[PDB]
Amino acid sequence: GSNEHVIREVAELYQVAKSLSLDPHYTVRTLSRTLSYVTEIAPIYGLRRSLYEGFCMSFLTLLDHTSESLLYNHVVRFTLNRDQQNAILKQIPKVPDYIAFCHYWLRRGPVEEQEHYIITPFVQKNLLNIARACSTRMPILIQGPTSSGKTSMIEYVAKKTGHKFVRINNHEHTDLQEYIGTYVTDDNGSLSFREGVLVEALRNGYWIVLDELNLAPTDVLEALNRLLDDNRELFIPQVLVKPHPEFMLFATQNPGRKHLSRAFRNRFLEIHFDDIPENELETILHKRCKIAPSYAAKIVQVFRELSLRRNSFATLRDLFRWAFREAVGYQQLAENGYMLLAERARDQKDKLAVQEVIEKVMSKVVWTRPMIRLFCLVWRCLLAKEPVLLVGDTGCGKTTVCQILAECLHKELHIINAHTENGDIIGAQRPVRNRSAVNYSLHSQLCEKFNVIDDLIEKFEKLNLIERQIIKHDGALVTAMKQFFLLDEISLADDSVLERLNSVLELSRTLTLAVSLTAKDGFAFFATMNPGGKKELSPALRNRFTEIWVPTEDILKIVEGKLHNNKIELARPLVEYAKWHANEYLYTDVISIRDVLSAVEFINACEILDLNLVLFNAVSMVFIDAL
Ligand X SMILES: Nc1ncnc2c1ncn2[C@@H]1O[C@H](COP(=O)(O)OP(=O)(O)NP(=O)(O)O)[C@@H](O)[C@H]1O
Applying CB under 6 A, the residues found at the interface with ligand X are 118-120, 124, 146, 149-152, 167, 169, 211-212, 251, 284, 288, 317, 320, 365-366, 368, 371, 394-400, 530, 540, 558, 593
Sign of CA dihedral 92, 94, 99, 104: negative
Question: Residue 486: in which H helix or E strand, if any?
Answer: strand 485-488
Q: Which helix (H) or strand (E) holds 562?
A: helix 553-562
Min CB(69)–ligand X separation in Å: 24
Q: Could you tell me the smallest distance in angstroms from the CB atom of residue 33 to ligand X?
A: 24
Q: For residues 415 and 438, what is the distance between their CA atoms, to the nearest angstrom? A: 31
423 and 462 Cβ atoms separated by less than 8 Å: no
Strands 249-251 and 140-143 turn out to be: parallel
Please identify, using beta-carbon distances, which residue of 80 and 371 lies nearer to ligand X: 371
575 touches 596 (CB < 8 A)? yes
Least separation in angstroms between CB 378 and ligand X: 12
Give yes or no for a contact between 248 and 240, defined as CB atoms under 8 angstroms apart: no
User: In the complex, what is the shortest distance from the CB of residue 294 to ligand X, in angstroms, rounded to a whole number?
Assistant: 22
- Cα–Cα distance, 41 to 94 (Å, whole number): 10
Is 522 known as a binding-site position?
no
What is the gyration radius of the CA atoms in the chain, in angstroms? 31
* 3-class DSSP state of 167: strand
By residue count, the chain amounts to 627
Closest CB to ligand X among residues 158, 480: 158
Report, in Å, the least distance between residue 590 CB and ligand X: 13
Q: Closer CB to ligand X, residue 310 or residue 369? A: 369
Q: How far is the CB of 450 from ligand X (least distance, A)?
A: 54
Min dist CB 150 to ligand X, Å, is 4
DSSP state at residue 261? P
Q: Is 393 annotated as a binding residue?
A: yes
Please indicate if the annotation marks 397 as binding a ligand: yes
Contact 559, 513 (CB under 8 A): no
Per the DSSP assignment, residues forming a β-bridge with 414 are 485
**Nearest CA to 594 among 557, 623, 564, 561?**
623
Question: Based on CB atoms, which residue is closest to ligand X, 68 or 212?
Answer: 212
State the Cα–Cα distance between residues 100 and 570, nearest whole angstrom.
79
The answer on whether 408 is annotated among ligand-binding residues is: no
Judged by beta carbon, residue 288 or residue 435, the one nearer ligand X is 288
Residue 144, annotated as binding a ligand: yes
Q: Write down the least CB distance from residue 231 to ligand X, Å.
A: 24
Q: Please say which residue, 45 or 165, places its beta carbon nearer to ligand X.
A: 165
Is 337 labelled as part of a ligand binding site?
no
d(CA 227, CA 376): 50
CB of 156 to ligand X, least distance (A): 7
Q: Kindly tell me which of 382 and 558 has the beta carbon lying closer to ligand X.
A: 558
Please report, for residues 57, 216, 262, 336, the alpha-carbon distance to residue 266 in angstroms, rounded to integers and kept in the order given.
18, 17, 6, 47
| 147 belongs to an annotated ligand binding site | yes
Nearest to 138 by CA among 11, 273, 26, 41: 41
Q: Is 136 annotated as a binding residue?
A: no
CA distance between the termini of the chain = 83
356 vs 560, beta carbon nearer ligand X:
560
Nearer Cβ to ligand X (213/497): 213
The answer to whether 399 is annotated as binding is yes
**394 annotated binding-site participant:** yes
3-state secondary structure of 457: helix
Q: Is 396 annotated in some ligand binding site? A: yes
Distance CA 224, CA 210 (A): 9
What is the rounded distance in angstroms from the CA atom of residue 504 to the CA atom of residue 500?
A: 6
Q: Is 449 annotated as a binding residue?
A: no
Annotated binding site: 144-151, 392-399
Residue numbering of the annotated binding site for ATP = 144-151, 392-399
